[PDB]
Amino acid sequence: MKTITLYLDPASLPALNQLMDFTQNNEDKTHPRIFGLSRFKIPDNIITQYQNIHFVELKDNRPTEALFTILDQYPGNIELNIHLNIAHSVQLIRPILAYRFKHLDRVSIQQLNLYDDGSDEYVDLEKEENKDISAEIKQAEKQLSHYLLTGKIKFDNPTIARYVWQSAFPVKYHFLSTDYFEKAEFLQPLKEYLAENYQKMDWTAYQQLTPEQQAFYLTLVGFNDEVKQSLEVQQAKFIFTGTTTWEGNTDVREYYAQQQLNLLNHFTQAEGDLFIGDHYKIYFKGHPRGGEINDYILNNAKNITNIPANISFEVLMMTGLLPDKVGGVASSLYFSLPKEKISHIIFTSNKQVKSKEDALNNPYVKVMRRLGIIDESQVIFWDSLKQL
DSSP states (O other), X not given: OEEEEEEEESSSHHHHHHHHHHHHTTTOSSSOEEEEETTOOOOHHHHTTOSSEEEOOXXXXXXXXXXXXXXXXXXXXXXXXXXXXXXXXXXXXHHHHHHHHHTTTTEEEEEEEEEOOSTHHXXXXXXXXXXXXXXXXXXXXXXXXXXXXXXXXXXXXXXXXXXXXXXXXXXXXXXXXXXXXXXXXXXXHHHHHHTTSEEEOOTTHHHHSOHHHHHHHHHHHTOOHHHHHHXXXXXXXXXXXXXXXXXXXXXXHHHHHHHHHHHHHHHHSTTSTTOOOTTOEEEEEOOTTOTHHHHHHHHHSSSOEEEOTTSOHHHHHHTTOOOSEEXXXXXXXXXXXXXXXXXXXXXXXXXXXXXXXXXXXXXXXHHHHHHTSSOGGGEEEGGGSOOO
């Protein structure tokens, strides 16, 4: 038999973990591998080092039929080693289960590894709080069995169905918050069901790589030497989280750039409400869609170091390069930051959020609060901050 490894993710965090798994196994130059990581392009000069390496697109959270063309290149007994995004696991596995079913004499699933997407898994589990979790698990197992045979996806509880894979296959889950599963009382049946099949996400794997593998990983994730050196300074470091625009009663983008500078000043200046201290080196991490607003902020801020907007906080954590303090405009990225590193999170006006009270009711803010990751005093509504 032959093992084929499949790495599938439409998001970022599972992909970063899957690219770490590839890096750890990178001395094996010929192991069959299929990559469907929508947000990551593996460079040509890495790809050409490998044999039996394949790429597939995802559409609507599923690998396309070009997957079958790849698997058909391996005509004997094959076992699939599959890595997936938890939130999207049901859709992502659909075409794989189909291939298995057609070839049940010769295709089998060796195992699954599933990784959190981010806050969504937790925000989704919160919606299940008043349900009978024991009963939801048993029903989902039954519907999964049916799925395996028919390809018919119809789960009564699509959220819980994300967690019943062990009823069919060997599985390992990698969670952002094991505390959530262990401390949310309503999830006790799910915690016990999962048994030894989960662990906390592995943020320190990079540190155990060879220096050569560390460089390889940085190249996979698009994190160049210039950026890396800038983040290794022996000084306290603060990074501001930029945004795009919000409901400011104007369509002038320069206004939103202007206001983000004032928010930054609340952190950097002694008279600011959110003052971090004069000994911090300041960095700016723009929103990936900030475009020219990011250029405006960088040019009009003094003595700030840019971290290219295409670089995620998830990859900063994967690489051990997260600054000492993070603050700025709210985003779901804050959900997975260590509690010690979060300063203040500032919510801007939108259809959903028009006060601090609304901001405290934000879905990921609610989970962070339940987990004690932040106190409510760390959530600020933007219009509370004076012009400095």
